[PDB]
């Protein structure tokens, strides 16, 4: 003890980090918010948090449990 | 022992259903003005010579 | 003028030093050179019944001379070839260790090698000249 310390930092531009905005969606789904507007809300957040693009995707049992996967995305991404 | 002698001067194209053979026109190398077109087996280039005897039958496209 | 082993042909050198050592007849071979095959790697013993140990000893001397020092270990790898494992694949296996050691041991009661520091034997001053001299003769194997 004493040879180990921690510090803190508020996040800079909490929209431009996709783990802050990963649990973003874990949590308002833990508040049950409707899948589409749930996703559409976080992408409409990190779109004009100053990101060239953004895409949020989720797969599973939306509509009573046949498995689907809807994807929500705005802006510009590359993949290559 | 009638043996020809024919240098090519151009390679008309690609015959054989599998692309096996080319065609070429040749000059008979003693009386140079006769020129005949025939097809080959190996890789050929411009100006190579060949040895045959079938100094007619002038063959053409082939399935 | 100025003969050094490094200027001789490898094989015929060692093939003549094996005869100089058999002639000189005072290099101490052990009592089992009739019964052994020089590596688990091999299948048959060397069909040069009597000679073979002299060949080996000679070739060794010639090797430690051009190296700096050579331990019994490294010699076992040099001489060991590939084993034939039957219906399995051939991998490299070393040479007998008592053979190699007993020649390196019997090569200092002749004065040709001597226990270098860092381990292993090294060449000797006597050895250095014996070979530097024994080269010049088969060197002049031209009249």
């Amino acid at each position: 003890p004493g040879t180990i310390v921690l510090y803190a930092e508020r996040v800079q531009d909490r929209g431009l980090s996709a783990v802050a905005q990963a649990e973003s969606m874990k949590f308002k789904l833990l508040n049950g918010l409707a899948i589409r507007r749930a996703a559409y809300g976080v992408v409409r957040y990190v779109m004009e948090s100053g990101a060239k693009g953004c895409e949020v995707v989720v797969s599973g049992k939306l509509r009573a449990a046949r498995a689907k996967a809807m994807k929500f995305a705005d802006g510009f991404l590359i993949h290559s | 022992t009638p043996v020809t002698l024919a240098k090519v001067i151009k390679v008309l194209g690609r015959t054989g259903s599998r692309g096996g053979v080319t065609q070429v026109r040749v000059e008979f190398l003693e009386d140079t003005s006769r020129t005949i077109v025939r097809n080959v087996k190996g890789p050929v280039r411009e100006n190579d010579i060949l040895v045959l005897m079938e100094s007619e039958r002038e063959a053409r496209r082939l399935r | 003028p100025g003969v050094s082993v490094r200027d001789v042909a490898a094989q015929d050198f060692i093939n003549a030093y094996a005869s100089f050592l058999q002639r000189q007849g005072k290099l101490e071979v052990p009592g089992y050179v009739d019964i052994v095959k020089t590596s688990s790697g091999n299948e048959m013993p060397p069909q040069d019944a009597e000679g073979w140990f002299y060949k080996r000893a000679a070739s060794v001397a010639r090797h430690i001379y051009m190296r700096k020092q050579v331990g019994v270990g490294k010699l076992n790898k040099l001489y060991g070839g590939a084993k034939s494992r039957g219906v399995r694949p051939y991998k490299h296996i070393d040479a007998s260790g008592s053979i190699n050691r007993k020649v390196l041991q019997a090569l200092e009661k002749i004065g040709i090698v001597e226990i270098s520091p860092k381990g292993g034997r090294r060449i000797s001053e006597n050895g250095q000249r014996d070979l530097d001299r024994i080269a010049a003769q088969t060197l002049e194997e031209d009249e």
Binding site: - | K41, G42, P43, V44, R45, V51, L52, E54 | -
Partner: protein, 198 residues
Amino acid sequence: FTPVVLATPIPEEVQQAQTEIKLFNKWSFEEVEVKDASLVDYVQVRQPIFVAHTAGRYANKRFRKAQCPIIERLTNSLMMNGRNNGKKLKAVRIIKHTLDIINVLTDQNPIQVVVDAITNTGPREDTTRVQAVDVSPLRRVNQAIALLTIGAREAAFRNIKTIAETLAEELINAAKGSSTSYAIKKKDELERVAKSNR
């Protein structure tokens, strides 16, 4: 002949006998012409080489194999039948022996023996799969080397002969169209199948 020499030995079978004419191992390239023609500049016997081993890069464009000595591609065509593959060293040794055997079976010039071997080796026209066609000056040489090295290779397998003799054997053999030549045995008996079918 400029018999110069420096500190190191520099022996005298070499100091002169190729500085003055830089030939094959001890064998001369001059006045050995490619008697048969229309196969010249495809058989390379006129850019002298000593050992049938180069850092060759012959297989990048189609016909760089042409400017390859007929020898070093005759030696390549040996190390085959895969347990032999990639042993160029053994192959050069095989040939250096064969050239000596032919030179004491017929006290000719031995690379004339080899080119005079492949004159009548490769077909002058051939069968193919539906009628006859004609053969290119390079699938003459190439199948020629093939059918003969395969003849000398298969002649020695279970027979007490070596592979220097069988090679020299199948070489003067097809070097006088002798009809004891696996090469011309296929070659004599697959052209007449070429003028017959049509």
